[PDB]
């Protein structure tokens, strides 16, 4: 059995890091973000070559780490995907959660 890692995770991939607590989604299944492949939840970085390591924000195939993180309609809910859920009708949550900019994602 995995651990949960301490808060403070950085996703660095790209020129607009974010930063992954995992206290803050305990309420959120393992193996809803680590999701299985071949039938096993798969616990490597996302972007680990031959997963989404398309690095084109652009690309809409599932290799597309841009996709991944920001997409609605995705076979596994997104970072965005979920957090657009979440906020439901609440404007303030919305800009918080799912904001481009000054949100907890992106300041
Ligand atoms: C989505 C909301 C998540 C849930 C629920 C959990 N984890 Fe997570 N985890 C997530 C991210 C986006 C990251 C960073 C990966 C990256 O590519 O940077 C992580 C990281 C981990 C790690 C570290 C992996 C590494 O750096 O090699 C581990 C071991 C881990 N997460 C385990 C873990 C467990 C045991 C969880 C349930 C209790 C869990 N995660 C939930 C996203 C999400
Ligand atoms: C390689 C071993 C992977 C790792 C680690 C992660 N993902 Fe993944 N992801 C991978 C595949 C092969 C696929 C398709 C799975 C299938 O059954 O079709 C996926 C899919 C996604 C999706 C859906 C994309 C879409 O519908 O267009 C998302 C949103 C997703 N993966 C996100 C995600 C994140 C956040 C991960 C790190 C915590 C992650 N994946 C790991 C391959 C691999
Ligand atoms: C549902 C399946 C989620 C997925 C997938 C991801 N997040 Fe999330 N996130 C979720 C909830 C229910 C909450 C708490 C909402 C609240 O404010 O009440 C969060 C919160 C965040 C936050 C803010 C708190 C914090 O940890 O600073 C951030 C910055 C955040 N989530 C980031 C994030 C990222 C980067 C994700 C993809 C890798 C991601 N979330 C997925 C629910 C869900
Ligand atoms: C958290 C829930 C997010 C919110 C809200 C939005 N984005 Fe995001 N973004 C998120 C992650 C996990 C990442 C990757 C972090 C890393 O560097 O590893 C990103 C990255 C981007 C980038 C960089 C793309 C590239 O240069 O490769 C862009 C341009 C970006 N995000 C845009 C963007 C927009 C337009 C958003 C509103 C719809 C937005 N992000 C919100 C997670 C989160």
Same mark, same amino acid.
């Not at 970085?45 to 780490?65: E, F, P, Q």
């Not at 920001?70 to 919305?94: I, M, P, Q």
């Given at each position: 059995?995995?651990?949960? @890692?301490?808060?403070?995770?950085?996703?660095?991939?790209?020129?607009?890091?974010?930063?992954?607590?995992?206290?803050?989604?305990?309420?959120?299944?393992?193996?809803?973000?680590?999701? @299985?492949?071949?039938?096993?939840?798969?616990?490597?970085?996302?972007?680990?070559?031959?997963?989404?390591?398309?690095?084109?924000?652009?690309?809409?195939?599932?290799?597309?780490?841009?996709?991944?993180?920001?997409?609605?309609?995705?076979?596994?809910?997104?970072?965005?995907?979920?957090?657009?859920?979440?906020?439901?009708?609440?404007?303030?949550?919305?800009?918080?959660?799912?904001?481009?900019?000054?949100?907890?994602?992106?300041?």
């Amino acid at each position: 059995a995995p651990k949960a @890692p301490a808060d403070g995770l950085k996703m660095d991939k790209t020129k607009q890091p974010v930063v992954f607590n995992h206290s803050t989604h305990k309420a959120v299944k393992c193996g809803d973000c680590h999701h @299985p492949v071949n039938g096993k939840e798969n616990y490597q970085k996302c972007a680990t070559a031959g997963c989404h390591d398309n690095m084109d924000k652009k690309d809409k195939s599932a290799k597309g780490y841009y996709h991944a993180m920001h997409d609605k309609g995705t076979k596994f809910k997104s970072c965005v995907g979920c957090h657009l859920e979440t906020a439901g009708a609440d404007a303030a949550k919305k800009k918080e959660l799912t904001g481009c900019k000054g949100s907890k994602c992106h300041s």
